[PDB]
C-alpha cells in the first residue's frame, strides 16, 4: 500500500507512487524524475495521467513506451492549473529533467515536494522567495553531518586534469567512465571535451542521451567506439576483470586504461581531500572513485531548510528505521532552535 509521505493532502495527487496499483482517490500521478526507484511500476500499459517535465516525458515515451495520450509535460517556472489546483515545477539540480513541485492547496496551505535534489543558494531566488511554505517533503539522503563532499566544479576540475595528464603522457591510454542511470553526464562530457574526442557508447545509452535536450549533443556523443577515446560502460563492468576484457576488444589500439566511477559519498571523504585522491591500480589499469554528488550535503540541506523556515518537515529518504527517523528529527529541531522559527 502507498505510504503517507507519497500523498499530497487536500488533493487527488500522488508523487512518485507507481508501484502500488490503482491508488484509491488519485486523479493525477506526478513523477519528479526518471530514476528507477521513483518510476518503479510504470510501463506501456499505464492508463492514468502522468504529470512531469518535458525531459522526463521524452524518456517515458521513448524508453518505457508509455503512450503519448497519458503524458502531460509542464514547463518550468510557470504557474499551471491541474485538476483545479495551481502547481509550479522548479529545477531540482539533480539529473536531467528532475523537478521539485510547489502545490497551492485550495484551503491556503502551500506544500513543496523536493523530489531528489541538490540544494543550492540559487534556489533562494526562484519562485520560492515569493510566499510562505507550510509543509516540506524533503530529500534527506545525506541528512547527517559526516556527509561532506566537494562542489561539482572542484570534482570536474580533478577529473579533467587527471585525464589530460595521463593521455598526454601516453597517447595510447583509453579513458572509461561508468554509468547506470541518467545523471552525472558532466563527468564524461568534460573529459571528452579536454581530449578533443566524442564519447562512445552503446545504442541503448545513446538513445537515452538523445532524450535529454542537451545543446549540441550530436557534436558530443557517438555509437562508433573506434573513433572515440572516451568510452562509457555499465557501472558493473568498472573493475579489473571487466576493464581487461574491454581492452581486449579494442584490437591493440590501446595499452592502458584510466577509469572513473562517480559514486555518491564514500567514507574516504571523512579524512581525505579531493586533491589527495588516489586510484586503485593493477598492471596497466587504474580506477578512480570520484565523489560527484547529485544530492545535498548535510550543510547545503541545513542552509536551505533554515532559509525556507517550513512549519512541518516530512522526510522521504531513510524512513525505514526508527534510528534513522529519530536522528533526522533531532537535526530538524536543532536547526529550528538555532534559526528561531
Ligand atoms: Ni534520483
From Swiss-Prot:
Q: List locations, semicolon-separated.
A: Nucleus
Expressing tissues? Expressed in brain, heart, kidney, liver, pancreas, placenta and skeletal muscle.
Signal peptide start-end: none
Regulation: induction: During mitosis. The mRNA encoding this protein contains an internal ribosome entry site (IRES) in its 5'-UTR. This 5'-UTR generally suppresses translation while specifically promoting expression during mitosis, when cap-dependent translation may be impaired.
The UniProt similarity line reads: Belongs to the DNA repair metallo-beta-lactamase (DRMBL) family.
Quote the subunit structure annotation.
Binds constitutively to TP53BP1. Binds CDC27, which is itself a component of the anaphase promoting complex (APC). Binds PIAS1.
Per its database record, what is this protein's job? May be required for DNA interstrand cross-link repair. Also required for checkpoint mediated cell cycle arrest in early prophase in response to mitotic spindle poisons. Possesses beta-lactamase activity, catalyzing the hydrolysis of penicillin G and nitrocefin. Exhibits no activity towards other beta-lactam antibiotic classes including cephalosporins (cefotaxime) and carbapenems (imipenem).
Protein name (database record): DNA cross-link repair 1A protein
Taxonomic lineage of this organism? Eukaryota, Metazoa, Chordata, Craniata, Vertebrata
